[PDB]
Symmetry: C2
Subunit: 259 residues, 2 copies
């Protein structure tokens, strides 16, 4: 149950995949467990069901900070929900619950509920939202993928996360320094079902908030591989990338075996 | 993988006695012989296998604060490890890892490993150690029971804990006030596989550090029911207790099926 043609380096790095994207706003006034958001979804709803991902911003951030992920990922055959939080000062564990509440809304109530495979749901988030994604995955092992972007959390040990997790760090991050956040998070994760750490060379904490080919490629491959079980994307992930000036460090538990 | 039926069919009397039916022996584990925790004392019964439970102290506390659980529980047919932490100021999430390290030592390396059922492992702990027990269960869903005693943690949301959990609070606790620690922890836990909250009437934060018939009865019933799958002890837990002057509040997801 896969979408799109056989991928190439060229296809996965293009700003848009093969799907046209529609959007629907969800008002803060119409939902309770999070702050509303924007749903980006493939206009072609006549084929198979799609996997879905919710994406959280960080502290003081709104969905505007994450908007680029909407078209970039939805155009690859996903439903993508860029959420706002109840308040912009919500902490990571609250962000976790808001991510889960947003997925519940998407599958139970939203206008696109019947185009989503409710068994194939992921989380992503920036900064405290990335901390939130780790805790959301810890608390719901049914989640099939997590992508914490320059994550920040006071909890450091995520050994209980059973979800395939790609942590994206920023080498020169001073807000969530990788030695204190991304790296301990990654090292704590179990060997299986699959993890990776991708560190963006020369990047700062805000790198996730603007179109980034490296973030896009690896996030598309991760969601394809783990939400869709699409092994045609394994080639992008394993063996780990080499000779990439954008990537200052990479760690993995390649190969990732279907079990 | 069959359940255990250690000891005689229980009664109110049998479960409230300080010393249960099994003879207790004890072995020290040196701090200098382990790395993942601070050593401890293993209490174990005198041709079957027994479930095992590790027990953490709280902040600035040593195993002496939890020593009474060793005989009281081991005499009911359990291997009980009262651990020390690497330092007395270790934080809850570190205490979680030390509880898990202590269990791994028990099953892989200890002098009592031949009598332990490695499939049936639980955690308990006081205060920060009770926060630790919640995090240990969050992180290892194979654990079959958790008993956080007057727990303290900064993390409040344990909805990801898949282990049967009995939280014991103290009504008048000012260190880990129930409204800020035990109650939010309990409410966050999932409905299944089974949870309970027992609040000790008039009790302070230090209630868990002295022989307490209520703590003992409910802890024995919980470990029997969930580490051993010994449903002969269901009767003590469900329906919830009533008319008990020692219990100022009780919450459950009875029945536990």
């Amino acid at each position: 149950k896969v979408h799109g043609p056989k991928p190439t380096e060229e296809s996965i790095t293009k700003p848009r995949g093969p799907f046209e994207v529609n959007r629907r706003s969800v008002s803060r006034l119409k939902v309770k467990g999070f702050g509303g958001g924007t749903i980006y979804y493939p206009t072609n709803t006549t084929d198979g069901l799609f996997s879905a991902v919710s994406i959280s911003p960080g502290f003081t951030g709104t969905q505007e900070t994450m908007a680029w992920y909407g078209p970039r990922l939805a155009s690859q055959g996903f439903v993508v929900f860029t959420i706002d939080t109840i308040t912009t000062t919500d902490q990571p564990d609250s962000r976790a619950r808001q991510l889960q509440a947003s997925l519940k809304y998407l599958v139970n109530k939203s206008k696109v509920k019947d185009i989503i495979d409710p068994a194939r749901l992921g989380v992503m988030g920036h900064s405290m939202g990335g901390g939130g994604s780790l805790k959301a995955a810890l608390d719901n092992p049914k989640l099939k993928a997590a992508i914490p972007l320059t994550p920040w959390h006071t909890t450091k040990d995520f050994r209980g996360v059973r979800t395939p997790t790609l942590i994206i760090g920023a080498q020169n991050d001073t807000v969530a320094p990788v030695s204190q956040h991304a790296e301990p998070f990654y090292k704590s994760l179990p060997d299986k079902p699959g993890k990776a750490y991708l560190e963006l060379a020369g990047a700062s904490h805000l790198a996730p908030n603007t179109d980034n080919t490296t973030i896009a490629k690896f996030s598309i491959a991760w969601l394809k591989r783990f939400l869709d079980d699409d092994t045609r994307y394994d080639r992008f992930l394993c063996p780990p990338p080499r000779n990439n000036k954008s990537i200052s460090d990479y760690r993995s538990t390649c190969p990732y075996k279907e079990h």
